[PDB]
Amino acid sequence: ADLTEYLSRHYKAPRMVLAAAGGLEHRQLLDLAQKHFSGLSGTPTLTPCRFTGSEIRHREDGLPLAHVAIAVEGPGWANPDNV
Amino acid sequence: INIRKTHPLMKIVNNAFIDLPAPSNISSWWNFGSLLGICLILQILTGLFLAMHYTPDTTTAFSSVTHICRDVNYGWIIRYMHANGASMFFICLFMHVGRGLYYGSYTFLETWNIGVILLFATMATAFMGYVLPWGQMSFWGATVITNLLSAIPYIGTNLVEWIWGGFSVDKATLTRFFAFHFIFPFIIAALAMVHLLFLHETGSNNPTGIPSDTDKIPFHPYYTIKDILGAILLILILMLLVLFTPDLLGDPDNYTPANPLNTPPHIKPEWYFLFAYAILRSIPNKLGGVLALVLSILVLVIMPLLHTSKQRSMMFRPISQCMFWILVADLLTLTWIGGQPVEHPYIIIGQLASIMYFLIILVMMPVASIIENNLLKW
Amino acid sequence: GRQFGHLTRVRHVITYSLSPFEQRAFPHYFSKGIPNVLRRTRACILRVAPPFVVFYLVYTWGTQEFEKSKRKN
Amino acid sequence: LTARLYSLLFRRTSTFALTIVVGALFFERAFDQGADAIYEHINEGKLWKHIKHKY
Amino acid sequence: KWLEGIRKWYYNAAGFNKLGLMRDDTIHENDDVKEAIRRLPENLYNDRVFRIKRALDLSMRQQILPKEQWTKYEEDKFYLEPYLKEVIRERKEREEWTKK
Amino acid sequence: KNLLRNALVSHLDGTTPVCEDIGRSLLTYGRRIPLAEWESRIAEVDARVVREVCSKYFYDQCPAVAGFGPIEQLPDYNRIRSGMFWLRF
Numbered sequence: 001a002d003l004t005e006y007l008s009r010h011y012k013a014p015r016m017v018l019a020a021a022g023g024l025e026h027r028q029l030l031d032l033a034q035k036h037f038s039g040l041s042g043t044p045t046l047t048p049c050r051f052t053g054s055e056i057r058h059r060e061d062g063l064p065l066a067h068v069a070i071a072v073e074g075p076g077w078a079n080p081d082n083v
Numbered sequence: 084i085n086i087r088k089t090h091p092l093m094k095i096v097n098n099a100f101i102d103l104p105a106p107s108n109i110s111s112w113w114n115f116g117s118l119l120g121i122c123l124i125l126q127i128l129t130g131l132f133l134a135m136h137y138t139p140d141t142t143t144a145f146s147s148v149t150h151i152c153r154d155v156n157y158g159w160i161i162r163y164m165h166a167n168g169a170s171m172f173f174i175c176l177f178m179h180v181g182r183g184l185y186y187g188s189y190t191f192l193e194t195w196n197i198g199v200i201l202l203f204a205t206m207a208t209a210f211m212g213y214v215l216p217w218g219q220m221s222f223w224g225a226t227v228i229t230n231l232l233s234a235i236p237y238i239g240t241n242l243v244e245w246i247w248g249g250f251s252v253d254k255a256t257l258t259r260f261f262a263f264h265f266i267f268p269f270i271i272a273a274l275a276m277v278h279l280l281f282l283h284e285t286g287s288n289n290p291t292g293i294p295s296d297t298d299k300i301p302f303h304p305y306y307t308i309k310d311i312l313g314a315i316l317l318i319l320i321l322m323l324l325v326l327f328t329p330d331l332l333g334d335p336d337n338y339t340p341a342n343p344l345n346t347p348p349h350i351k352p353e354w355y356f357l358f359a360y361a362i363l364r365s366i367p368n369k370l371g372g373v374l375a376l377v378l379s380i381l382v383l384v385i386m387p388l389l390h391t392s393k394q395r396s397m398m399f400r401p402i403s404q405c406m407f408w409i410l411v412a413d414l415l416t417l418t419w420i421g422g423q424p425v426e427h428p429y430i431i432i433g434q435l436a437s438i439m440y441f442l443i444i445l446v447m448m449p450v451a452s453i454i455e456n457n458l459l460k461w
Numbered sequence: 462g463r464q465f466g467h468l469t470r471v472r473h474v475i476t477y478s479l480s481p482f483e484q485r486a487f488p489h490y491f492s493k494g495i496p497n498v499l500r501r502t503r504a505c506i507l508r509v510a511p512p513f514v515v516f517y518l519v520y521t522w523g524t525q526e527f528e529k530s531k532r533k534n
Numbered sequence: 535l536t537a538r539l540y541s542l543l544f545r546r547t548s549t550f551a552l553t554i555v556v557g558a559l560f561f562e563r564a565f566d567q568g569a570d571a572i573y574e575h576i577n578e579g580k581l582w583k584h585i586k587h588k589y
Numbered sequence: 590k591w592l593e594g595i596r597k598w599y600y601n602a603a604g605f606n607k608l609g610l611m612r613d614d615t616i617h618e619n620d621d622v623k624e625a626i627r628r629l630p631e632n633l634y635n636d637r638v639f640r641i642k643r644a645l646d647l648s649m650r651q652q653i654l655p656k657e658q659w660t661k662y663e664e665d666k667f668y669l670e671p672y673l674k675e676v677i678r679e680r681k682e683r684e685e686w687t688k689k
Numbered sequence: 690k691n692l693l694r695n696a697l698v699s700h701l702d703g704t705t706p707v708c709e710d711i712g713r714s715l716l717t718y719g720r721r722i723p724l725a726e727w728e729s730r731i732a733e734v735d736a737r738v739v740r741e742v743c744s745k746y747f748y749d750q751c752p753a754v755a756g757f758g759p760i761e762q763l764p765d766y767n768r769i770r771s772g773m774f775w776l777r778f
């Protein structure tokens with residue numbers, strides 16, 4: 001019931017891109033997508049979060065090599081700062 | 084990569100202070116090594132300036148210290164800095180030693196031996212430094228301690244008139260004491276470096292006695308700033324001591340010219356030397372008195388033989404902890420008897436206190452702690 | 462004893478640490494640390510101070526007995 | 535107030551050193567004047583400047 | 590029994606049931622104690638280093654874990670003593686074989 | 690700039706990377722950005738803007754460190770903090 005609830009809540013209307021790349025055509029794919037996507041009936045999320053900044057260490061000496069990552073907060077998509 | 088990890092001096096500084104694996108457990112009781120280091124360099128520098136403005140002669144000594152207290156700018160504050168810095172030095176030294184005995188850190192051998200040599204050197208050094216004002220108390224105390232050196236037969240009178248410069252206290256004796264006080268703390272700093280060298284050989288300790296290889300944290304930037312806090316607290320205590328009451332621990336009877344016929348009623352060494360002065364006047368014997376003094380200090384050296392327990396520190400063993408606080412109270416009792424005059428019932432209770440001191444340290448520590456071992460079903 | 466790199470072979474351990482700028486300097490100084498330091502005081506001083514009340518009884522008792530013995534003029 | 539202060543005086547090391555030395559000199563000024571003022575204000579009466587005022 | 594009540598009172602006053610420790614964590618390191626620590630099972634040795642790291646972090650932060658987490662008096666899975674007795678017997682065997 | 694141009698041009702070829710470029714473009718952009726606009730926005734940045742952005746994001750910060758394995762030689766976090774910003778050593 002919770003997984004069908006998840007399916008009913010998320011994967012439906014505002015959030016979907018149908019892409020087609022290659023030596024293909026636009027209008028016939030447009031018409032058949034209008035055929036197959038007829039009657040979806042889909043009609044509050046994506047909120048920001050906090051970048052805390054912290055440390056965690058796994059002492060596990062049964063491993064052959066050492067894996068260490070460090071990160072600061074990045075810009076995102078919509079800035080030339082990202083470029 | 085780094086200049087610190089590759090330069091053959093900055094390697095020494097890096098494996099001393101920057102990247103030393105230090106415990107993540109030690110309280111303010113472990114700051115006192117750095118506190119003695121900063122007290123020692125403060126004593127070196129203030130003694131250097133005081134030795135720049137001083138003339139060692141038996142008439143010019145008291146006159147010259149009067150000159151430093153009156154004429155030269157801030158000469159009285161640097162005089163008081165050197166005196167009360169010596170007093171705070173000895174208080175931090177006994178807190179250091181009490182830490183090293185109570186937290187079981189005396190399982191190290193050569194660290195303890197070099198610390199004992201440091202103890203002899205600083206006690207003789209500060210004694211000669213207290214002889215340097217040429218006060219009446221200092222004159223008689225020099226007489227007392229040097230004839231205690233003459234207490235051993237067949238060598239004594241010859242050896243002590245050899246370290247006198249005549250058949251009495253001379254100008255030459257004051258020059259000798261100026262030279263040896265003037266040269267000893269550099270040897271003391273060298274022995275402190277050897278002390279720290281064997282310490283970095285072995286590794287530090289925690290309050291618990293449990294070896295702490297899982298949580299070695301660097302000295303910088305944690306114990307650097309904690310030693311900054313502790314040293315600023317020591318500096319402010321030292322400055323309130325040298326400014327608000329310079330003679331709360333400065334004995335007033337020092338401030339007279341050394342008349343060789345004076346003989347004051349009260350006589351004592353300076354108040355850090357009271358328990359070394361009480362055990363002498365405890366047992367009525369000359370060679371027995373100096374032998375009991377040598378026995379007191381050398382039994383405090385003997386102490387790592389006496390450890391019979393299965394633990395290291397007294398944080399977990401409450402009854403021997405309380406016995407150690409009985410020892411702490413008996414130390415303070417010997418200080419109080421040193422603060423009381425040479426009279427008969429006080430010598431009775433001083434013999435009681437000194438023999439109870441030796442009864443705790445000689446016998447009751449291993450037997451008490453082995454009852455503590457025996458009680459834990461081991 | 463030596464520097465890092467060799468000391469003890471430990472697996473199975475996670476440690477969570479926080480950057481100090483997210484956190485306050487003195488969290489509940491006068492409401493949790495004061496009961497902590499009162500408990501740490503309350504544990505040990507009834508073991509450490511009773512040697513000092515022996516010292517203070519020796520102080521008063523020996524002082525008054527000495528003044529009684531030496532002021533018989 | 536705070537972000538302006540980080541923007542001005544806390545970006546590079548030389549500016550931080552200059553502003554702490556300039557803060558030390560202004561603290562020298564105000565701290566010496568306040569310390570001497572309060573010290574001679576709690577010792578009003580039998581202090582030497584009254585006798586220099588008379589004489 | 591009087592002495593067994595002394596033992597219970599003494600383990601209560603010792604203060605590492607407060608710290609969450611056991612019998613096999615308070616031992617001073619000579620050479621042979623270190624040898625018996627090297628002679629340990631894997632799960633017990635990992636539990637030992639975790640209990641050591643807990644006691645270190647707690648005594649740093651000077652906090653005692655509450656009443657629900659204290660190590661009781663005879664629930665103790667004591668383990669280092671047989672290895673320690675074997676190492677003492679082998680050491681005394683070697684030294685007495687040199688004495689003879 | 691040379692390596693980023695060459696990496697993006699060598700990326701945008703084949704069926705899967707170009708189709709996933711279409712996907713990851715229309716996830717948030719509201720359109721798909723072609724190669725020419727990224728070429729322009731590469732050409733629109735000199736060294737001064739680069740050191741502005743690096744001073745904007747990297748200098749004297751609060752990072753996030755994840756260590757995994759035999760990582761005992763990694764020093765404590767405040768060493769990374771006090772060595773993260775240059776006081777010119």
Ligand code: HEM
Binds near residue numbers: 148209
């Ligand atoms: C090598 C460095 C040192 C030099 C050059 C030095 C030199 C002097 C001089 C010239 C005096 C006489 C000043 C006076 O009469 O007021 C003096 C006094 C004294 N020094 Fe040192 N000293 C040094 C280090 C120390 C150290 C390390 C101690 C022990 C903590 C010490 C303990 C004393 C004491 C107790 C006095 C008598 C203080 C007083 O006048 O009330 N000195 N020193």
Ligand code: HEM
Binds near residue numbers: 117119123186197201
């Ligand atoms: C001359 C004065 C002394 C100086 C300058 C000095 C210096 C130091 C320093 C710098 C440390 C390391 C800091 C720390 O405590 O963690 C230390 C530790 C130590 N010192 Fe001294 N020390 C002095 C006197 C003594 C004496 C008289 C003894 C006893 C014989 C002694 C025994 C020790 C011990 C056992 C430690 C290690 C404590 C532990 O790991 O728990 N020191 N000392």
